[model samples]
Target chain A: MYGLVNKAIQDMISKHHGEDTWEAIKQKAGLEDIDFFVGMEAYSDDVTYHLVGAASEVLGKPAEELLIAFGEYWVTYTSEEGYGELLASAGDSLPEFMENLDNLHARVGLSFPQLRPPAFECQHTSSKSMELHYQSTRAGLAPMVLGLLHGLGKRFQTKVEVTQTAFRETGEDHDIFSIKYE
Target chain B: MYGLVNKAIQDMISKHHGEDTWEAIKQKAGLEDIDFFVGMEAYSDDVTYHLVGAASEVLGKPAEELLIAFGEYWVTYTSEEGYGELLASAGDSLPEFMENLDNLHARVGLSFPQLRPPAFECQHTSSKSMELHYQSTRAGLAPMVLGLLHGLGKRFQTKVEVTQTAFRETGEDHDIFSIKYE
Candidate 1:
């Protein structure tokens, strides 16, 4: 992961939760020695994992809860960081963006070499229903995926319901979501 | 991307194809100025994509073919670079190692902070029969995944048959493999 990731985690906690909460997270992660996470530099995968774990403990929240928030925040943060054009380029409707995630990553490809991006497949079971299949190289971020979908829902100003039908954690192939949006 | 990735590419090409072949690769990728790839440094994502494209053209091989060999070499290369212990720690049997791919990354976590490692889930359809799901973030590396699986098969000295049932390239959720090992 890039510093952008840690930076997002930091920005999310600090802006919304305040700097004190964010400060405690770093300390709890035993990352107090480093005061800055470079926005584009690489860190150990453990670094992000530990931070999330530490943040969860510091906030007395489940890691999933934080991840969900973090997912939603990513959409908000990317625009603030001036990557809004890419998001808008995806489309105005929620389902439109869902269809163009690969396009989003393609548009954002030049930034990092290690961007092991997630793969999303939208299976339109019907006009108002979809079975979304998400595959990723990383693990333990299912709630984050949920957060992203919800955040997109808010962004598009659409009412949506999403349910995880299959889980990777349970020996399933990938995360499958039954989704509906209007 | 980290220099380790580029460095590995360089190593694989230089060792097997010689320095001249690697030089042509760099030149074709418009990265001739970068004579040495620092093992821990950052690079543009294009740097790698170009390298593979250039390598494919220079070698007159498909990118998938190159990725296949490149990926197989990764396992051997990692061990030669003295990261074999983590590989060994994953497990001895081929199937169990497949089951513990996530654990291998977990154990290898401390070294690279940005290690958004891939996840693997395995189902024992029968004794010595498995259904494997591979989730990854990046695209166009499916062949590499295949090479790595074969490399593991060789490492465990296990006779294995592996087939990919679902493909991310085709807009499927992820890559699914049906495997039988003896």
Candidate 2:
């Protein structure tokens, strides 16, 4: 139960407490839960989502296109960490949907780091509109999201408003973008 | 009313629309918001707060004291970019903070590629309670908000939990974290 877990505990004691304190923690009591790690990883995912949308605008495309097609490209290529593994697998229909977008990378640029395998399946809609808005500092990744959307939104010319949230805790801020086109 | 409140429409478009869209937006609307770029550079004095704390059984100090002092250190040293700037300003803080931990590198390794200054700060809490946590990840950086926490908790002497929240439609996920101690 306390094999790898103890490593972190031992480390904390050594740095913050004395050897005696470290040893005491070694013998202390605690509970284990899966939610622990899951909760924290969620924060990183949120930031990645913001970056992907920004990338879409930079690449001159709708945000939906990037959310779907661009994600497919990276699910296979870039990450060994399986950051978007579940999202990619769920979006297996991406190829058929993204057939219209030109070469993925040439148009959008690189996918935002750790934001690969778009989290959602995408479809072009004209009768109704959808949008994505987020805030983040990963401005560099904006083009990639734009590229993905460009390919996906070719038919409807959907609108995606990518706005930067004011910086408070983080410098990049939040992002707010909407998708619609009549 | 909207037009008057928003004095620099062109600049707003440029700042919010990414470089590629900026030109097209200007052509379509014929507005010039030159001050937009300059506005983006300004940092507001708003104080954003982040709290990181942990508990343990074998340390020689109280958890609350450790948490407060460490958080104070972070607020003083945290920056929007890299720690090089912070280090330059306060000569002794870095070393003083670093001296508080054990296996500091292993608990809070600096290999965080996406974060600017990825490190853990551990300080003695009490004879039985020591705490270790992150100082900051850097400005506009990316990836693993939880991973950083996990590393911090692991480095310290007790079970640790980490969490972060992003505004909804701010284009990001809201919360994430991990807990480890046994």
Candidate 3:
């Protein structure tokens, strides 16, 4: 149940020795720089779960089955929010995106009450390149992010991992980290 | 500046040989036990100060004049759900009601940040009354009352003195004291 997707991605990248994999994925994920904004509200409502459950029933499948098949349904129903755009752009292989979103929401929700990460996190590139360039100005950012992930984890009743990578021109410039379940 | 309304009310009552002048004012003010709720929102694009200034001009007075006038305006507003009956009932006085709302908003925005009562104090009504009435069920009533008085004081740019009084068949009873500023 755990680590299958992450392990698969890691093995696929390493097996191919693909340096541009992160950039390719990022572009495919539709994360343009303009989507980032500070101080926006980040709360989850009971409405999402209820709506999704109803949608699953309408699709004549269990909720988990519907979620696994979200790639086909995501763009068909969800609004044009940032995350929605990212998920919709994933084309035929939609489960990867759905799994990522589900995992992120679950993990964040557990640590923070009534908080969720925005559907989009985008920013324009500046002249200077720095690690974590799009850092938040507000002090609440990190806690809110972690809390949302925790809550998402609680909702899914599963442990999850988060990996962030930066693709640089230099051979060894890429940075990535992953959190593992116990 | 501090507790002027309380003193003025006490003096008015004492001057009339202990007659209930305050209750009379509330009665004359035409208060009813009707309950209603309203939701207000502010946006960055709103020209709040310009609106306030214009209202003051229309009233032939300053902003404070409008805030006090608002209490009178509310007495006639509807007690119905999801709609304002009072304003419709106040057909001819509608303009005055709008003016009062603007005045209240401006005054509260400017004041209520610097309120402190001078030499203020209180005592229990009676041990029996305290045990029977004020025991553990201290929910809903106090907070709602405080929120209301605080908003009122903010709207008027003045301290609010809330005095609770019980009326008897013959005449009147005692009072409880509370103040709101900052």
**Cα lDDT tens digits for candidate 3, B1-182:** 22222233223333533534434433343332212111232222112223233444532333322332232223322123222443333233222222244343344445444432121123323221110111111111221222233333434453322222211211222212222122
| Candidate 3 global lDDT | 0.29
Query: Candidate 2 has what TM-score?
Result: 0.19
Top TM-score model: 1
Q: What ranges in model 1 sit over 4 Å off? A: B1-182
lDDT of 1 by residue, B70-129 (tens): 777888988878788878888889888888888888766667677667788987765666
Candidates 1 and 2, the one with greater lDDT: 1
> Backbone collision count in every prediction?
13, 65, 27
Clashes of 1: 13
Which scores higher on DockQ, 2 or 3?
Answer: 2
Listed models, DockQ each: 0.01, 0.02, 0.00
Model 1 root-mean-square deviation: 19.4
Q: What DockQ does candidate 3 have relative to the true complex?
A: 0.00
Could you give candidate 1's per-residue lDDT for residues A8-95 as a string of tens digits?
9999989877988888888889899987998878788889999999987886655665776688789899887988888888988877
Q: State each model's CA lDDT, in order.
A: 0.78, 0.32, 0.29
